[PDB]
Amino acid sequence: TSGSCKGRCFELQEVGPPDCRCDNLCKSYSSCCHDFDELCLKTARGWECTKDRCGEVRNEENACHCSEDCLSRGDCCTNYQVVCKGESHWVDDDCEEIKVPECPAGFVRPPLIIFSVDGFRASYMKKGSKVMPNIEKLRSCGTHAPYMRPVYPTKTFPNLYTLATGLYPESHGIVGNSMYDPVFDASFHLRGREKFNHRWWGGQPLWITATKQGVRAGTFFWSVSIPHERRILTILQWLSLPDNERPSVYAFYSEQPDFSGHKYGPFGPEMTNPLREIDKTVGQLMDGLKQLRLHRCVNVIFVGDHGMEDVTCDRTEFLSNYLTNVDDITLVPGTLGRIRAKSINNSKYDPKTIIAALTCKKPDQHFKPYMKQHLPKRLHYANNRRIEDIHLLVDRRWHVARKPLDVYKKPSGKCFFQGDHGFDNKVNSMQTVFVGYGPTFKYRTKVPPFENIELYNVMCDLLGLKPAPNNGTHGSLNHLLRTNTFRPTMPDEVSRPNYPGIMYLQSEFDLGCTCDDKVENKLEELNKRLHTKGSTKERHLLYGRPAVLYRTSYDILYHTDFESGYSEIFLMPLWTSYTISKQAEVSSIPEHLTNCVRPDVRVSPGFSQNCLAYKNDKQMSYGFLFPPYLSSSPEAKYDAFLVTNMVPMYPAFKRVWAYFQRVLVKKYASERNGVNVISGPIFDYNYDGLRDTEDEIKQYVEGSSIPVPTHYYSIITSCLDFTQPADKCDGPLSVSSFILPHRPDNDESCNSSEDESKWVEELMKMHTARVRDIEHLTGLDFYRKTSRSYSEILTLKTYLHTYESE
Ligand SMILES: *[C@@H]1O[C@H](CO)[C@@H](O[C@@H]2O[C@H](CO)[C@@H](O[C@@H]3O[C@H](CO[C@H]4O[C@H](CO[C@H]5O[C@H](CO)[C@@H](O)[C@H](O)[C@@H]5O)[C@@H](O)[C@H](O[C@H]5O[C@H](CO)[C@@H](O)[C@H](O)[C@@H]5O[C@H]5O[C@H](CO)[C@@H](O)[C@H](O)[C@@H]5O)[C@@H]4O)[C@@H](O)[C@H](O[C@H]4O[C@H](CO)[C@@H](O)[C@H](O)[C@@H]4O[C@H]4O[C@H](CO)[C@@H](O)[C@H](O)[C@@H]4O)[C@@H]3O)[C@H](O)[C@H]2NC(C)=O)[C@H](O)[C@H]1NC(C)=O
Ligand SMILES: CC(=O)N1CCN(c2ccc3ncn(CC(=O)N(C)Cc4ccc(C#N)c(Cl)c4)c(=O)c3c2)CC1
Ligand SMILES: [Ca+2]
Ligand SMILES: [Cl-]
Ligand SMILES: [K+]
Ligand code: NA
C-alpha cells in the first residue's frame, strides 16, 4: 500500500507487504505504489525521436530520450540512432550470417528473447508478408518452420504455459482458459485473481529452470495495461543492467493479432493494421538491440500460441436440442465442450445416458462426444482431475453451447465475434508460427513443422541449462541449431530376449484350440527350419528389433513372413514386425482354416493363451497381429494362426482391424513402394499415456489371465524416396502410425453401418499418432538399427501424419 517506486521502476524482484510493488505485474494485482504511473509509465512526447529532439537536454519526464547521454543511460527511443546519428533501421540492413556471437564485454552467454504473439496463424507469414518487413526478415534470414503445431486445446493459457514448460496441459495443469478444479472447488479464468494462485500452475517453467541453475530470468507474464512500446523499452533497459544484475532470458508478449482476430475473423480487412503494428514493435526491438550492439549477440524466438478460425454465433450447436434434462449439466462451452454434473456428488447423474443422447443424433452434427479416455491419444488430454469425463470435440468453424440464452444476449442477440480458436490441434487454421534468429540458430534455414512441446528443451540448450523432465524429445530439434550442447543417445535396453527353440510336444497343450493342419519332402524341410531360426529376419525386421525399456520376460519368435517379441507376462506379442512389398498378393483365409488356432511348440502351455477362454467370453473374440491375408505362400499361412500371434478383439473392433489388414496394408504398400509394419497391443487403463504395469489391468478375457488391450497400434515405415522399395532404402525414412481405441462398439463412427470402405480409414486418420506416443505407451524403443543419424531418427519419431490439406 505505502512507499514509492523512485529508483525501482520495473524492478526484477517482487516485494511482499508492507511494501507496495514496482515490478511488471503490479498493475495486475492493483498493488503498485501510488507513484508508479508517474515514474514508471511515462508517455510524454511519445515513443520516437524527431530531428528537433536530437541532442536535446535530458528531460526526465519524457517517455524515452534523444539526449546525448541516452545510450549510456540505456533509455534512448529505439529510433534514436536512425534519426539522430545517421544509422539505418535494422530491417534495411542486408542479412549477414551470424557465425559467432558478437556480444559486448561482460556478456557471459547470448541472451534469449522470446517474442510471443497471441493468435498468430501460420498462414499470416505468407498472406501478410507485404505488411511485415521486420518479421519477414527474421523469417528468411534465420531458421523457420512452415508452421508449428500447438497443443490441445488450442487456447492461449494452455499453449503459453506449454511453451514455458515443455509439458502437455494434462501435466502442467493449465487444461483450458477456463477450468474448474473439484478438489479446490474453485474456477480459474483469464480475468480475475484466482489465476494468480500458484496452486494451478505445475511443472517447472523456463524462468524457474534458469534461476535454479544460476541464470537470471523473471516470469514471462505482462500486465495488459502496460503498452507495447513500454514493454520493449523495459526489456532494453534491463539489457543495460550491470553484468551481475542483468537477466539472460526475456519475454515480450503481444495480445495481437488475437484480440482483433476474434472481432474480425482471421482475414478480416481490419486485420492488416494489427499485423503492421506487431511488425513495427519487432522493428523497435531490433533497432533497440542494434543501438546496444546486441543485434548479432541475442537469440530471438518469434513464436505464436495458436491460430484463428472463422466462427460466428449462428454456427452454434445447442445441447438443449439434444438433452431433455439440460439443467442437470454444467458445460464449459465454445470451440471445445467439457460436461460435468451441475450438482457435485449427485448419485443419479449418468454420463452414459448423456453420451448416448449426444451420439450421432443429427446427420450434419458439428460435434462428437467422447469419454476423455477415448479421445485420440495424440491429444494427450485426459490425465488431470480438471478435465471433465465427458468431452465434446467441436468441428472447426463451430461452437457448442448449453442453451440459446447463453449465446443470444438481451435485447435481441447481435453477434460481434467472427473468429475463435481452441479446436483439435491438427486443424490447419489452428497452426501457428516459429522463427529463430541469432548466433545459435541456423542461417537461412527451413525446418519441418514441429510441436510446441519441443521448444522448452531447445530454449534450455540456448541458455546452457539442463531441462527439467518434460514431454519434448530432446535432440529432435537439434537440426534448428548451429551449435548443439545436447548429444542425444539411445536408451539402454533393460530386458534381453529369450530365443526359444522347439521345446514342447503337441500333446502337452490343452488349449481347447483346433486347426485343420495335418494335411500334406526334403527340400522345403531345411528351408522351414532356416525361417524359424531367423533367415528372413533382415527382410521383416528392417530397423533392428525394438528395445524393451523395462523389466520383463519375453521371447523372439521368427517366421517366414513376420518376427515378433512375445511377452510371457501378457501372453501376447509386445510387437509384431513384417514387410509387405509393392508386389505382394492378398489372399483369403481358406474355408478349412476359418477357426484355426495352433499351439506354438516353442512356448510353454503355461505361457500361452487358450481358445476356451474366448469361447466362454461371450463379448470377446480374437484377431491376429500378423495378418493371414498377407501370407507369402499357403504353407507360410499356417504360421499366422499360431496361438502366439493371437490377440483379444471385440467383434466391433475386428471390423476395423480386418479392413486395415486385408485392404489398407496392401494399399499403403502399393502407394509407398512397400511398407514395413510393426503392430501390437497397448494397455493404458489409467489413461496417463504410459505403459501399464500388469497390476493396473482392469479387464481380462473371461476366466483367464489374458489381459485386454485398451488400444492397438501400428507403425508403418517406408523409404522417403519412394522410387526405392521399403526393404532397399538407402536414405531417410517416411512413417505414419496410429493408436486405435479397442472399443466394443463403433459409436464413434456415425457411418459404421456402411461398408468399412466408407468409415474405417476416417477413424484411423483421426487416431494418427507419433512413434514417440507409442513408445511411451509400450516401453519400447524403435529404429535402433538404421543408417541414419540419431537426431534424424528422433525427428522421425516425433513426426505426426495429420491428413490435412495445404
Ligand atoms: C510428460 O512429462 C511429464 C514430466 O516428466 C510426465 O509426468 C511425470 O510422470 C511421472 C510418472 O507418472 C510422475 O511421477 C510421479 O511423481 C509423484 C510426485 O509428484 C509430485 O512431485 C513432482 C516432482 O516435483 C519436483 O520436481 C519438479 C521438476 O519438474 C518441480 O517443478 C517441483 O516443484 C518439485 O521440485 C511434481 O512434478 C508433481 O506435479 C504434479 O502434481 C502437482 C500437484 O497435484 C500438479 O501441480 C502438477 O501439474 C503435476 O500434476 C500432474 O502429474 C500428477 C502425477 O504426479 C497427476 O496426478 C496430475 O493429474 C497431473 O498430470 C507432484 O507435485 C510421485 O509420488 C510418484 O511416485 C509414486 O507412484 C509410482 C508409481 O507410479 C511409484 O513408483 C512410487 O513409489 C510412488 O508410489 C506411492 O505413491 C502413490 C500415490 O502417488 C501410491 O498409489 C502408492 O501406493 C505409493 O505409496 C511418481 O513418481 C511425475 O509427477 C510427472 N510430472 C509431472 C510434471 O506431471 C508425463 O508422464 C509425460 N507424459 C507422457 C505422455 O509421456
Ligand atoms: C505461475 C506463476 O508464476 N504465477 C501465476 C500467474 N500469475 C500472474 C500474475 C499476473 C498476471 N498478469 C497478467 N497476465 C496476463 C498475461 O501475462 N498474459 C496474457 C501473457 C502470458 C505470458 C506468459 C504466459 C506463460 N507461461 C502466460 Cl500463460 C500468459 C497473467 O497471466 C498473470 C499471471 C503470476 C504468478
Ligand atoms: Ca498407463
Ligand atoms: Cl477452455
Ligand atoms: K467369444
Ligand atoms: Na456407429
Q: Cell 544484475 belongs to which residue?
A: 245
In 3D, which of 688, 766, 742 has the Cα closest to residue 382? 688
Best CA proximity match to 442, nearest among 734, 181, 141: 141
Rounded CA-CA distance 124/137 in Å is: 14
299 lines ligand 1 (CB under 6 A): no
d(CA 337, CA 333): 5
Atom 28 (ligand 2): residue with closest C-alpha? 157
CA distance 727 to 580: 9
d(CA 154, CA 25): 25
Does an H or E element contain 580, and which?
A: strand 572-580
Residue 791 Cα distances to 359, 475, 746, 778, angstroms: 43, 5, 39, 21
| Distance from the alpha carbon of residue 393 to the mean position of ligand 4, in angstroms | 12
- How many angstroms does the Cα of residue 89 sit away from the middle of ligand 6? 61
Distances (CA, A) of 104 to 108, 294, 464: 10, 7, 19
The CA-based dihedral angle spanning residues 651, 757, 582, 448, taken in that order and rounded to the nearest 10 degrees: -100
Ligand 2 pocket test target in 30, 221, 235, 253 with most atoms within 8 Å of CB: 221
Cβ-based neighbours of 177, under 8 Å, separated by 6 or more:
155, 156, 157, 158, 189, 190, 422
Please indicate whether residue 219, judged by its CB atom, sits closer than 6 Å to ligand 2.
yes
Ligand 2 pocket residue status of 195, Cβ below 6 Å: yes
**Residue 272 neighbours by CB under 8 Å, 6+ apart:** 128, 131
Active-site annotation, residues: 156
Distances in whole angstroms, Cα of residue 373 to Cα of each of 369, 391, 456, 622, 749: 12, 10, 27, 23, 16
Test site for ligand 1: of 151, 171, 451, 692, most ligand atoms within 8 A of the Cβ? 171
Buried-state track 557-570, b at ≥16 Cβ within 10 A, e below 16: bbbbbbbbbbbbeb
Decide: residue 640, CB within 10 A, 0-12 exposed, 13-18 middle, 19+ buried. Answer: buried
d(CA 660, CA 662): 6
- Where do we find the cell 492378398? 586
- For ligand 3, a single-atom ion, the residues with CB < 5 A are 684, 686, 688, 690, 692
Sort residue 240 into left (φ over 0), alpha (ψ -120 to 50) or beta: alpha
> Binding site for 1-hexadecanoyl-sn-glycero-3-phosphate: what residues are annotated?
156, 177, 258, 421
| Residue 272 beta carbon below 6 angstroms from any ligand 2 atom | no
Closest approach atom of ligand 1 to CA 201: 46
CA distances from 221 to 26, 302, 386 (A): 11, 16, 23
Grid look-up 539489457 returns: 239
Give residues after which the chain gaps, C-N over 2.5 angstroms. 520
690 lines ligand 1 (CB under 6 A): yes
> What is the rounded CA–CA span in Å between residue 315 and residue 328?
24
Q: Which residues pair with 370 in a beta bridge?
A: 391
With a CB cutoff of 8 Å and minimum separation 6, the contacts of 82 are 49, 88, 89, 287
- The answer, yes or no, to whether any atom of ligand 1 lies below 6 A from the CB of 202, is yes
Q: How many CB atoms lie within 10 A of CB 738?
A: 25
527: DSSP letter: H
Q: Which residues surround ligand 6, an ion (CB under 5 A)?
A: 746, 749, 752
If phi > 0 it is left, if psi is from -120 to 50 it is alpha, else beta; for residue 631 that is beta
Q: How many CB atoms lie within 10 A of CB 460?
A: 25
Ligand 4: centre distance to CA 175 (Å): 7
Written as nine digits, the cell of 217 is 530470468
Could you tell me which residues come within 8 angstroms of residue 743 by beta carbon, excluding any fewer than 6 positions away? 374, 650, 652, 653
**Residues whose CB falls within 8 Å of the CB of residue 149, separated by 6 or more in sequence, listed in order:** 425, 426, 431, 449, 450, 451, 452, 800
Residue whose C-alpha is closest to residue 268's, from 157, 408, 147, 121:
121
Question: What 3-state DSSP class applies to 9?
Answer: coil
Q: Cell for 390?
A: 465427458
Please tell me the residue having the least CA distance from ligand 2 atom 18. 221
DSSP H/E element including 445: strand 445-446
DSSP class of residue 191 equals: S
Ligand 1 midpoint to CA 382 (Å)? 15
CA of 552 to the centre of ligand 2 (A): 45
CA dihedral 472, 473, 475, 479 (to 10 degrees): -70
In the chain, count H helices and then E strands.
23, 29
Contact assessment for residue 84 and residue 54, using Cβ atoms and an 8 Å cutoff: yes
Residues with Cβ within 8 Å of residue 490, at least 6 apart in sequence: 547, 781, 784, 790
662 lines ligand 1 (CB under 6 A): no
Nearest-5° Cα angle at 209, 204 to 213: 150
Atom of ligand 1 nearest to the CA of 173: 48
DSSP annotation of 457 reads: H
CA-nearest residue for atom 103, ligand 1, is 689
Any atom of ligand 1 within 6 Å of the Cβ of 337: no
Q: For the chain, what is the radius of gyration of the CA atoms?
A: 30
Beta strands at 249-257 and 112-118: parallel, antiparallel or unpaired:
parallel
Q: Which amino acid is it at 13?
A: Q
User: Of how many residues is the chain composed?
Assistant: 806
Q: How far is the CA of 193 from the centre of ligand 2 (A)?
A: 11
Binding site membership of 772 for ligand 1 (Cβ less than 6 Å): no
Query: If DSSP codes are grouped into helix, strand and coil, which group holds residue 302?
Result: strand
Provide the 8-state DSSP code for 127: H
- Minimal CA–CA distance to 298: which of 477, 433, 440? 440
Report how far apart the first and last C-alpha atoms of the chain are (Å, whole number): 55
Report which of 393, 414, 398, 268 is spatially closest to residue 338, judged by C-alpha positions. Answer: 393
Atom 6 of ligand 2 has which residue's CA nearest to it? 196
Q: How far apart are CA 375 and CA 647, in angstroms?
A: 23
Q: CA–CA separation, 570 vs 558, rounded Å?
A: 19
What lies within 8 Å, CB to CB, of 520 at 6+ separation is none
Give the Å distance between the CA of 760 and the centre of ligand 6. Answer: 11
Peptide bond just before 153 cis, omega within 30 deg:
yes
Atom of ligand 2 nearest to the CA of 28: 12
Centre of ligand 3 to C-alpha 645, Å, is: 23
C-alpha cell at 344: 457435485
710-711-715 Cα angle (round to 5): 155
**Nearest-atom index, ligand 1, CA of 171:** 61
List residues forming the annotated binding site: 118, 156, 177, 258, 262, 305-306, 421, 684, 686, 688, 690, 692
- Check if the beta carbon of residue 544 is closer than 8 Å to that of residue 785: yes
Write the burial class of residue 217 (CB in 10 Å: 0-12 exposed, 13-18 middle, 19+ buried). Answer: buried
**Does 83 sit in the ligand 1 pocket, CB within 6 Å?**
no
Binding site membership for Ca(2+): which residues? 684, 686, 688, 690, 692
Q: What are phi and psi of 332, to 5 degrees?
A: -90, 115
How many CB atoms sit inside 10 A of residue 734's CB? Answer: 18
Q: 549: which 3 cell numbers?
A: 525399456
Nearest ligand, CA of residue 595? 5
